[PDB]
Design a protein around this ligand. Structure first.
Ligand SMILES: [Cl-]
Ligand SMILES: [Cl-]
Ligand SMILES: [Cl-]
Ligand SMILES: [Cl-]
Ligand SMILES: [Cl-]
Lengths: 215, 218
């Protein structure tokens, strides 16, 4: 039942701090919380100097690898260092607000499924599609069965390995890990997660993450 | 010439618009965000026949608030509201449950009246990766392209004439109506997407309430 986590961490928002720790430390620590998660593999770009100065740089359950050209190389590098783990948990560096109950709910999949899946949250707003290249609404987009893709993303290590290898080599346009499976013809599951599992991308996200984390 | 009428559909177990943040209900917070703009000379609130929550708010007697009666759909309500709209050449229709509207977004939207013959809505680009589930199932069909994908927000700002007609023609014809702009779209019209802040949220859920309180304090 052993699980390796992989964080593609590769002035970056994961090195911003909420209180005690960086966003990167919150995210990582939320994964290490769950007992099935034995190690966390963190991809870091070789330019990155901030990582080495954090306590996580010498934590015994963390391994660092050189991040690659794209998200997907990093993750493949991470998989290759997951040792002997059979399932693999991919998590964004900048998602520090993960709860243990979505995480446990996601981890339940290694016994119910052969594909794996992702945390996600149903879409609530009414969605519009712009006229291509324009300022103007073309039509309303149907939101039933529309989901926000979140992370962690939880998969059989070898399946992940195979879908990523093929999409990188065929030069497919990859966004999340789930999209690499999709590209190879798989259909990973949507596990409903809390909507407060946000990615800190803009200045004001930081205030929000902090709000969410203290709640 | 530049005077604007605002319409707020307030119908359709506690209704969330009547949840409170500090002093006021959501509705009061929303309506007040409308009243602040110089151009918003009045707000017409559509309230349903048998509701005793409204008359108890400072709003049941504001000099710039007209009440009118609720309808069976959001669409009917607004149509009702436009009759109370006076001599306004443009109508601003806003959710009662969207209390966090900021002034700078509203002035960008109002500006359209100078520029558009269609009008437009506040919106926010989608920044997240979106998935479509297989129908009736809980697995990813595919990734939905977020390029040109936008959250629809309010207010929605339209010329009163065009708003009246497209809402009319869409109800008469049995169109699937979600928001005012979608009454326009069914009628073959293409209203502008005006970007506003993403903290313009809708209070529906229970956890929704504290996030709004946070955003209001900001
Ligand atoms: Cl927790
Ligand atoms: Cl949403
Ligand atoms: Cl003005
Ligand atoms: Cl403001
Ligand atoms: Cl989003």
């Amino acid at each position: 039942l052993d699980v390796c986590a992989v964080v593609p961490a590769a002035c970056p928002k994961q090195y911003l701090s909420i209180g005690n720790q960086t966003i990167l430390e919150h995210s990582v620590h939320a994964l290490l919380a769950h007992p099935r998660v034995k190690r966390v593999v963190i991809a870091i770009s070789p330019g990155d100097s901030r990582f080495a100065q954090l306590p996580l740089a010498n934590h015994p359950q963390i391994t660092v690898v050189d991040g690659g050209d794209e998200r997907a190389d990093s993750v493949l590098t991470g998989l290759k260092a997951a040792g002997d783990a059979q399932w693999v948990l991919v998590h964004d560096a900048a998602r520090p607000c993960l709860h243990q109950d979505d995480l446990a709910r996601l981890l339940a999949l290694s016994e119910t499924s052969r594909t794996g899946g992702i945390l996600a949250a149903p879409v609530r707003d009414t969605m519009k599609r712009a006229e291509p290249g324009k300022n103007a609404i073309a039509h309303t987009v149907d939101r039933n069965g529309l989901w926000h893709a979140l992370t962690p993303q939880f998969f059989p290590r070898e399946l992940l390995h195979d879908c990523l290898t093929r999409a990188l080599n065929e030069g497919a346009t990859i966004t999340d890990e789930a999209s690499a499976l999709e590209y190879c013809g798989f259909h990973p599951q949507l596990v409903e997660g809390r909507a407060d599992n946000i990615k800190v991308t803009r200045p004001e996200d930081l205030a929000l993450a902090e709000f969410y984390l203290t709640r």
